[PDB]
Design a protein that fits this description.
The complex is a heterotetramer, with 2 copies of chain A (about 260 residues) and 2 copies of chain C (about 400 residues). By secondary structure, chain A is an alpha/beta fold. Helices cover about 50% and strands about 15% of the residues of chain A. Chain A has one domain: Aldolase class I (TIM Barrel, Alpha-Beta Barrel), CATH 3.20.20.70. Chain A contains 12 helices and 9 strands. In chain A, α2 runs parallel beside α12 and α11 packs antiparallel against α12. The two termini of chain A are about 25 Å apart. Chain C has 2 domains: about 160 residues, Rossmann fold (3-Layer(aba) Sandwich); about 220 residues, 3-Layer(aba) Sandwich (Rossmann fold), CATH 3.40.50.1100. Classes of the chains: A alpha/beta (about 260), C alpha/beta (about 400). Bound molecules: pyridoxal-5'-phosphate (2 copies) and cesium ion (CS) (4 copies). One pyridoxal-5'-phosphate (PLP) binds next to α10 and α14 of chain C. It is classed as carbon-oxygen lyase.
Chain lengths: ~260, ~260, ~400, ~400
Amino acid sequence: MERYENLFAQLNDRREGAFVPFVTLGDPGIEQSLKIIDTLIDAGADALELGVPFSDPLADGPTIQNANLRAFAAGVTPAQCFEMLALIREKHPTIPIGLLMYANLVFNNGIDAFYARCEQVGVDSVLVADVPVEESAPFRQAALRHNIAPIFICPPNADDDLLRQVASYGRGYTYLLALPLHHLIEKLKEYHAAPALQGFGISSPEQVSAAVRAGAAGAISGSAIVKIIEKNLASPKQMLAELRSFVSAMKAASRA
Amino acid sequence: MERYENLFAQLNDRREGAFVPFVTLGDPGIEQSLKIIDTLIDAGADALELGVPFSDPLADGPTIQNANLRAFAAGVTPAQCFEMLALIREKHPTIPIGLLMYANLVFNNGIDAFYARCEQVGVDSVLVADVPVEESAPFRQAALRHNIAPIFICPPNADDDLLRQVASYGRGYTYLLALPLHHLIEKLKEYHAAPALQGFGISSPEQVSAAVRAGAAGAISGSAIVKIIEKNLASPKQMLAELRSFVSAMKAASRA
Amino acid sequence: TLLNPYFGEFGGMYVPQILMPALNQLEEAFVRAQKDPEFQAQFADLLKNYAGRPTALTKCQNITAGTRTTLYLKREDLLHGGAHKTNQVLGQALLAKRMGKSEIIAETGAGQHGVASALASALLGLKCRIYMGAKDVERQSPNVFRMRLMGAEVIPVHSGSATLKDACNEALRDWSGSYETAHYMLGTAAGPHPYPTIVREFQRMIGEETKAQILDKEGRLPDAVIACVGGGSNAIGMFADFINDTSVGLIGVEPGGHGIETGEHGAPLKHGRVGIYFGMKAPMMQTADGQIEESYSISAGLDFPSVGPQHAYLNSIGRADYVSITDDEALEAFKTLCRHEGIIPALESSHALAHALKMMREQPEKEQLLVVNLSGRGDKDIFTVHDIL
Amino acid sequence: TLLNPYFGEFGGMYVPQILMPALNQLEEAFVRAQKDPEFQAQFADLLKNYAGRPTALTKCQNITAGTRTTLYLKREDLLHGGAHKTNQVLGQALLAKRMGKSEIIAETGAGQHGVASALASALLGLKCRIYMGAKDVERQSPNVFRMRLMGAEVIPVHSGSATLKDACNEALRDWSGSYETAHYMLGTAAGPHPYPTIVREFQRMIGEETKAQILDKEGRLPDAVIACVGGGSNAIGMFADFINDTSVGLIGVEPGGHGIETGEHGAPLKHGRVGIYFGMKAPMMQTADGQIEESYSISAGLDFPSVGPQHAYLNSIGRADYVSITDDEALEAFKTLCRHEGIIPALESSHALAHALKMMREQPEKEQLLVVNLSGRGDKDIFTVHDIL
Ligand SMILES: *Cc1c(COP(=O)(O)O)cnc(C)c1O
Ligand SMILES: *Cc1c(COP(=O)(O)O)cnc(C)c1O
Ligand SMILES: [Cs+]
Ligand SMILES: [Cs+]
Ligand SMILES: [Cs+]
Ligand SMILES: [Cs+]
């Protein structure tokens, strides 16, 4: 839970908005992934959002869907993901790590035992892509008991009763995705939601300064990072060197 | 009509039963057929039963059915059949010639016009294979008016009311095909039917003396002659030489 | 004979003398049967409980849009077997049973009759041999299997042109000898009497229902009832109960084929002259010197080279009119029913429909109540319309 | 929510947050619809007049000979479409219409659902896109054509294993954005609520009829009603009106496949553990670490890796029992229905029948009234039973 609250404090006191990369754990290989995350980080990544490989991503688009297939073919399992998360945490004590998840993988070993091993390897938050706020409670109590922030997606079609519920139940940050862009940020700060982080279409620095200026506490670049990895399939120096320069460009665009 | 009555008179006065071959006109060629009929005749044939090629023989078995196909492939038409019948009559004034027919070929040019050209080329009788005694009248009057005997098949399942009708309506000879063999011959002579000629399974001389002895006035060998022609497809000397010896064997078997 | 073999000059019993006791016993039995309540009820219960009768009468919704035509379809495509062949075949196997017969002989070209004799015999424990032409057997592989499956013995004809014409003859030869144990199950209202009158009385319920259903729905008799005419059972099944309602028209569609002007067609009743074949005197497709020829149509189950005696006769006293539809007019009415009402009609019945679509397109402001006889579904045809398309 | 998403612990709405307003509007509309007389009558008239309902209840004559079993078959194989899919698809397109929606999204594996959405949309003027997996599209060439024909747009999935699993996801992604114009037409009583309750209320008439028909014919409720369980609509359609008749058993057959002991099977409810997928918490076929796997069956339309929530629940309070049937037990019951009653049943429904044949062969002197749900005809399967045989 906590490391987020430390990140947003620090960024606030130095006029900065957070920039967060998403990437899939195990893509295109275990070895590869750990080098890719150490490059995202040193390039400027303020927090990480990782994906765990799951079968059908009812909440994800084609790029992430075959990104999961690339990690499956690598012979990545659940077990190798927790092993990866623990060493990422070993070389990096301060950075928040959150996880995109699907409810079958949480439930499969008991909801509590999953939040137990998350807390025990250092994961700060978990977003479970297909458990709506009204099917939240087993997952939400279990995260709180092992002091892991439950992240929720606040969607474009967000009615007001939702906005109250999300603000009351998430922690870490609110994932942002009718309603004027600015109007949502306003209502969430009214309702006392955790830091709203814009995730819809963040791929060029102009949008990061746009999100920061709008009152969003920063931005999550989903597909972009994955695509640079796809383009650079087997282009390894260009794979990382493009990634480095992209993250630092994105990051530069948030310190005002 | 008449030539039959002359044949049965002559045979009676010399203790003889008639033996009649069937064959298809135009099989396996026009030229061929005329040589085959002149050989049947000189070998001993007392009368002839010819078939005209027709499409589906609802009253005939597989041998005659593909015998018709052999004549069709020869490029035999109705017109070439009447031309053949006229020259057969030209070389042979005395012998009865009867025709197996199907009602579409009689009807096709008018029933009367068909019996007209039959009388005009010398045909003595016509059996129309698929016109039962109760659909007879147009065909029967028309044959009588051009003095052509209407032949009828008297079948195994012949009820008594049929036997009266056939005896009253045919001329030339009765074609024979429950009821003891002898009992039919008796009832027909009672009813005053024309000479009953046995046509069921006449293929070995023993049966010709059997038919003659039973009171049948003689016998018609259907399929046998056709089969010798089939066996001898392209064996021409054996084709005729077997035919010669067969007809004379059959014929020998009827003079007692 | 107990009944008349003639519809005017058409018809008769023009069969070899030997088959005649068989036909006369079948007439005597059918006359008894139609007079016996027990026979009617057992027949009814099979139709209702095994086959699915009454079939539906669908009011078309979207094909007559912006015209004054009202189309209804009689849904013999929702009959067990997905083709009207089922109502006569049940009624004739019941008759064989009532005659003490134990076998069924039958013949086929496309498959639909063979399959419908096999499904009735399996249902009533009768031995069943289907005679089918080799040309037809090869082409009709999916239907051969479906027959074999249901326990029917299939004998491959391949003599003459190896078509239905030939299959029809061999089956009768077999009947000459088997006729006291076996019963020949003739595919349509055609051939020697009494099969014209039997095959109509056992398809007659189609008319009986279309009438009460249109009366329930519209409150007035239809204006014309269209129906194709392969050999006449479906058509004569629809017409039968309307024939004495002089106000109601009866149009029967015939296979125009590639074109009347091209000869490859199956339109004997309007463009082929009278003759004697398959035991009847009725119009047929023959050469100038009486040799019968093969007809032609996109619909296999519509190409047969003659027509029922009573259809030839209703044309002569001007009570019914028979028209034509070419192969491409059938295809277009096929795609139109699918894309518009969501019914895949059999190519055979599309000929009846193409004709009612032509009638409404040609005179759009004419208010007229139509009823087409949808007489088989088109699952069988989705491969052939897909070899064209 | 207006209704309960849970059948005991099974069920739920476990969908991305964005789809939730779509599901809640669909619930609100279905609750209105079921309360509106106008909706019921229009729905009824289509079922009766376009599809052919009531379907028949056949008393089997020859399969139970010399046993004390009485078999009846509910004849959903004589439904327009020759497969029970038709009664829910009409009722849900009427609902889309009543919601002001103009498109239909749908997904398929074997074809039968895609075809049944296409034939309902053509009939009601709705735009229709079917999502189908490439593996499935290639294998299901005859059904692709039949869909295209009726005007449906077919998009070929080929991501993940390119199966129904994958097709089901892509269709929902499309729904996330299209949901105020389009309506997702889910194939079975499974997935997110309310599709479990909707797909049952629109297949419920099967039970309603089987009951009054057995009451008319036999005078007493059946002893057990058997039915296969692909994903549950046909089964829950039959069970629904008998569930409160505690005396009546309900057995649901599951695909045993090559064998329970061989894994290649589709029997999630008895031999696969609970999980969350396709928006519901219900039993499913997955690996030991939650990755869902493909099931298997001879019947394409029976292999789907989970089961309806309410079926998982009736098993838990012991109200219904679910059993298995292998592929070879399905084949033998197929040939037996054909050769004996003359009905070609769909391989899917043969699984329900094989189970009722086993019940009577194993205890021949037990007098027991059975009703199998014959739920599709087997024309589709005569090529596959012929690749085996
Ligand atoms: C066999 C067939 C026919 C052709 O003949 P009818 O005697 O007119 O019935 C008609 N419709 C269908 C759909 C058929 O399969
Ligand atoms: C699609 C199919 C099913 C499988 O699913 P249900 O949900 O049980 O109905 C069953 N029967 C037939 C014949 C089918 O085509
Ligand atoms: Cs019905
Ligand atoms: Cs015809
Ligand atoms: Cs019905
Ligand atoms: Cs299943």
